[PDB]
């Protein structure tokens, strides 16, 4: 189907404790494929998926230099933001940046992105037009004026419509074993006595990829949204994800309850019940 590529970056200042810490990671869909951490002894961008390992030394050298450069420009930008917000040099602050692209099943650009946040709040974002900006406040408007003057959007647009999509397509091909495979959830229902009067029914979805999933409980066909404990989808640590949904059921009433699972890896939504 559709796919995405994202590069995420975080710099965190630490006054009196040297230069900011810089960490960046790249993803295709829900798959991590590259990482860089400035605090590694002689830091390099490193592979984190098998299908990127085949890129040659020139690729890793360029990537590494780009990461080092962004760490350095982030240091300058953190200093600028202290000025823009009239802040002291004593505190730790955070600068986050994301950029990348979404493509459709045919490989065509669906959306490009480039956006920044300061201290966990929106700062400036490239709009969906890839031609104009949304500034969150009067500080970000200063950046906007500079970036309008320098025709920054046009340069980002050229990357997002060109290289971003072209390299994503390359990765999807080289990684076709995994990036183009959905792993359906393995599902089951468990029963957890609370007392002689009631028990929890917990519906599990394990080992699925990608992360998007819907899990719901029904009682005689009616959705139990308000009475369901639904945990956040969580990584298993091996590429796949987990989720569960639980409801408290009076003794003897279990056969009224069905769990429903939707995942792109499932041809049709599944219906499960507790089987003693």
């Amino acid at each position: 189907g559709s796919h995405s590529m994202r590069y995420f970056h975080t710099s965190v200042s630490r006054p009196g404790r040297g230069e900011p810490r810089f960490i960046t990671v790249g993803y295709v869909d829900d798959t991590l494929f590259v990482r860089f951490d400035s605090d590694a002894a002689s830091p390099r961008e490193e592979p984190r998926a098998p299908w990127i390992e085949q890129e040659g030394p020139e690729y890793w050298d360029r990537e590494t230099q780009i990461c080092k450069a962004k760490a350095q420009t982030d240091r300058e930008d953190l200093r600028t933001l202290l000025r823009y917000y009239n802040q002291s040099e004593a505190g730790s602050h955070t600068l986050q940046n994301m950029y990348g692209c979404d493509v459709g099943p045919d490989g065509r650009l669906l959306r490009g992105y480039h956006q920044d946040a300061y201290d966990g709040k929106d700062y400036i974002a490239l709009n969906e037009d890839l031609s104009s900006w949304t500034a969150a406040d009067t500080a970000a408007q200063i950046t906007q004026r500079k970036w309008e003057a320098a025709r920054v959007a046009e340069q980002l647009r050229a990357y997002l419509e060109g290289e971003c999509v072209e390299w994503l397509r390359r990765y999807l091909e080289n990684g076709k074993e995994t990036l183009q495979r959905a792993d359906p959830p393995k599902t089951h229902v468990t029963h957890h006595p609370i007392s002689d009067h009631e028990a929890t029914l917990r519906c599990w979805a394990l080992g699925f990829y990608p992360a998007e999933i819907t899990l719901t409980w029904q009682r005689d066909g009616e959705d139990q949204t308000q009475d369901t404990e639904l945990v956040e989808t969580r990584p298993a640590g091996d590429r796949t994800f987990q989720k569960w949904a639980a409801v408290v059921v009076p003794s003897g009433e279990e056969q009224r309850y069905t769990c429903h699972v939707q995942h792109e890896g499932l041809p049709k939504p599944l219906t499960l019940r507790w089987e003693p």
Binding site: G26, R62, E63, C67, T73, T143, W147, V152, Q155, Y159
Partner: peptide, 9 residues
């Protein structure tokens, strides 16, 4: 692959 970031806030 990444892009060089030339810009400053």
């Amino acid at each position: 692959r990444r892009r060089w970031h030339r810009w400053r806030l």
